[PDB]
Structure formats: C-alpha cells, structure tokens
From a paper:
Whereas the d,d-transpeptidases catalyse the formation of 4→3 cross-links between peptidoglycan pentapeptide chains, the functionally related l,d-transpeptidases (Ldts) catalyse the formation of 3→3 cross-links between tetrapeptide chains. The established substrate for [name] is the disaccharide tetrapeptide monomer 1 (GlcNAc-MurNAc-l-Ala-d-iGluNH2-m-DAPNH2-d-Ala).
Notably, however, when [name] and 3 were co-crystallised using a precipitation solution at pH 7.0, we observed additional electron density extending from the sidechain of the nucleophilic residue Cys354. The results are in agreement with formation of the dipeptide (d-iGluNH2-m-DAPNH2), covalently linked to [name] via a thioester with Cys354, apparently reflecting a key intermediate of the transpeptidase reaction with the donor peptide. In the [name]-3 complex structure, the m-DAPNH2 residue sidechain protrudes into the outer cavity, while the d-iGluNH2 sidechain is located in the inner cavity, suggesting that the donor substrate enters from the inner cavity. Note that no electron density was observed corresponding to the l-Ala residue of 3, which has previously been suggested not to play a significant role in substrate binding. Additional electron density at the entrance of the outer cavity was observed, in which d-Ala, released during the formation of the thioester intermediate, could be modelled. The overall fold of the [name]-3 complex strongly resembles that observed for unmodified [name] (PDB 6RLG27; main chain RMSD 0.65 Å). Polar interactions of m-DAPNH2 with His336 (3.0 Å), Asn356 (3.4 Å) and Thr320 (2.8 Å), as well as water-mediated polar interactions with His352 (3.3 Å to water, 3.4 Å to His352) are observed.
Author numbering: 57 to 407
Write the structure that this text describes.
C-alpha cells in the first residue's frame, strides 16, 4: 500500500553544494536497493549503504567545482521508487591552508595557546571559528581571539593545568571562509601540557628565577633592556629555541646602523616575544648581570645559564617580567596572549 519515499541531502539542480559533509540518500516506507553517484567525467564515487538498507552516504572526499549525478532506487510493499539528481559543488575563487601549532604529539608548557594560522586573509572569521573544534581533558573553558587577519588563537582563562590533553580539529575543507575563499584541506593535531614552569625576571633584583611546580630550581643574574630601550613588563610565552642565532634588529624594523640597531651572533637563545626579546648567552655583560641593564630588550644571562634555560625550558612555558621602567608587552605581539584581559579575550573579535 505504501510507496517508498527518497530523501537526499541535496536537491536536483542545486549549485554551490558544499563539500564539508558527505552526500546522503535516505529511504522511507521501504529500503534502498541501490545507489550510484558519478562525477562529470563518468567516474564512480565511493559510497556505502547502511546495514539496515535505509541510508546511503558518500565515503570519499568530494571535489570542488564538480558536477555529480545521483541515482537511487528503493523497494516497498507498495512498489518501487526511483529518482535521479544532478548538482554542482562549490567553485572557490581561492584556497587557503591552515597551519596549526603546537606540533602533533608535542608536550608544551602551561601557557601554550592553540594557534591556527591561515596563509590568506580570512574574511569570515565566524566561519573559521565554527570549523575549529577544540577538545580538552579535563575539560576547561576557552575562547578564540584573532591576532591579525590570518592567525587565530584559542586559550583558557588561566594557565593550563598540567596533564591536560588537548585535541584540535581544523575542518575547513569545503567551508566558505568568505569572498570565495575555501579551505584547501583539514588538519588534526594533539598535544599535552607538561610541568608548570614559570620564570620571573624582577628588575628590582635583576634576577631571573625559574620555578618548576612551585619549586625554585635556578636563579640567574640578568641584564635586561637599558632605560632607553627597556624590557617591557608582562607575561611572555616561550616560543622557539636556538643553539645559535644571529639577532638582527632590521627584522623588527630597526636599521642595523641606526642608533638602536644591532646585529649579534649569540648562543643558546630562547625566544619569548615576536618583538625580538630572547633569553640568551651574553659573555660580554656578565659583570652587569644582576646589577645594571645594558641590552636593547633581551634577557642577557651567563653562557651556562643560557644553556640551562635552553635545556630545561620548553615551548609554552612562561616568563613574567616585572618592575621594569618599560611598558607592558602587547597582547597581540605573537607571544603576549596572556596580557589580554579575559573579558576582552572571551568577547573575541570575529566581527
Ligand atoms: Cl575525474
């Protein structure tokens, strides 16, 4: 008596079908006998019928700018039912690829934010945020905030609890990110939070003290930025580490041969700001370390102490600078995320 009815996730003649989800067909008042899908060059598209015969779905990634033809047939006590559908998928103007930090499988400090950097400007930040799923164990609240037009960050209100597992899924393939920009591919990554490592550089004492889970493990005399080019106060996130690097002021916009310029080859350099602040070996300022500031901003320490820092501090650990004559590190520096107040971070800037 009842005839089968066929329902698809697309309609005949549709355009702009997005490829961020499989295409599916479902039968009612009956079961699907067979479903086929082919592309505009005639090639079959891989699919699977559910065991109960009621639901069919594509099983392989669908492509941008293709035309697909779907043919389904179902059987019921009333009789048979058949339909054909043709539709076209999104045709992007541009592609953008996301790049996620930290690396897959890494162990990082309690200050490490999730970073998703696209290689193009993102017109629809809301769509980007919606395609990124952050899972945490233990679960903890967090929020997105854009540092510039290409890079978005995600972090909780306070530093991570040690031992937290973090899973990141950037599912932008098939997502319209605005102005015809679509994701080139998806990215999946996982990382773990390690020990709590907080080094405090106190200008009042000119000592850099490293505390691991509350325990003082190292005290390093330091020479920070001189009065005319002081080290900014605030919370710094540890980034990359270098056995040696040539610090070049022109990288930060200051000509080398200008009054505040510098080019210096140094050892055991740990970067803590995009603005150019490093902890590094400074044999020339050992006597000043612990007494007077002499740098253009870097935390100068002894060779042995700089190497200790390199060996025992990891990406995402924290350096806090206090009591300098400087201002405060900008929240959008690149490693200054924690200087943005939570109320402002949580409200976000997706526009
Ligand atoms: Cl083909």
């Amino acid at each position: 008596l009842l005839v089968p009815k066929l329902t698809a996730s697309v309609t005949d003649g549709a355009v702009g079908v997005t490829v961020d989800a499989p295409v599916s067909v479902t039968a009612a008042d009956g079961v699907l006998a067979a479903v086929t899908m082919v592309n505009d060059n005639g090639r079959p598209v891989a699919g699977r019928l559910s065991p109960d015969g009621l639901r069919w779905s594509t099983t392989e990634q669908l492509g941008y700018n293709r035309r697909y033809t779907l043919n389904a047939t179902a059987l019921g006590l009333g009789g048979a039912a058949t339909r054909q559908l043709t539709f076209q998928t999104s045709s992007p103007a541009h592609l953008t690829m996301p790049y996620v930090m930290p690396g897959d499988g890494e162990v990082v400090g309690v200050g490490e934010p999730v970073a998703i950097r696209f290689d193009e400007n993102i017109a629809d930040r809301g769509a980007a945020e919606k395609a990124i799923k952050i899972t945490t164990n233990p679960p903890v609240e967090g929020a997105f905030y854009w540092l510039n037009n290409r890079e978005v960050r995600w972090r909780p209100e306070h530093f991570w609890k040690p031992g937290t597992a973090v899973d990141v899924a950037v599912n932008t393939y098939g997502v319209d990110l605005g102005e015809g920009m679509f994701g080139e591919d998806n990215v999946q990554t996982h990382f773990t939070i390690g020990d709590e490592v907080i080094a405090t550089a106190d200008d009042n004492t000119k000592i850099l003290t490293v505390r691991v889970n509350g325990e003082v493990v190292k005290s390093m005399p330091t020479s920070m930025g001189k009065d005319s080019t002081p080290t900014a106060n605030g919370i710094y996130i540890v980034g990359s580490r270098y056995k040696h690097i040539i610090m070049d002021s022109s990288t930060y916009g200051v000509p080398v041969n200008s009054p505040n310029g510098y080019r210096t080859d140094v050892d055991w350099a740990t970067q803590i700001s995009y603005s150019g602040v490093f902890v590094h070996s400074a044999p020339w300022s050992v006597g000043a370390q612990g007494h007077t500031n002499t740098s253009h901003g870097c935390l100068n320490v002894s060779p042995s102490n700089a190497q200790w820092f390199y060996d025992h501090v990891k990406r995402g650990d924290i350096v806090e600078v206090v009591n300098t004559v400087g201002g405060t590190l900008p929240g959008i520096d690149g490693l200054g995320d924690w200087n943005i107040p939570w109320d402002q971070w949580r409200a976000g800037n997706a526009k």
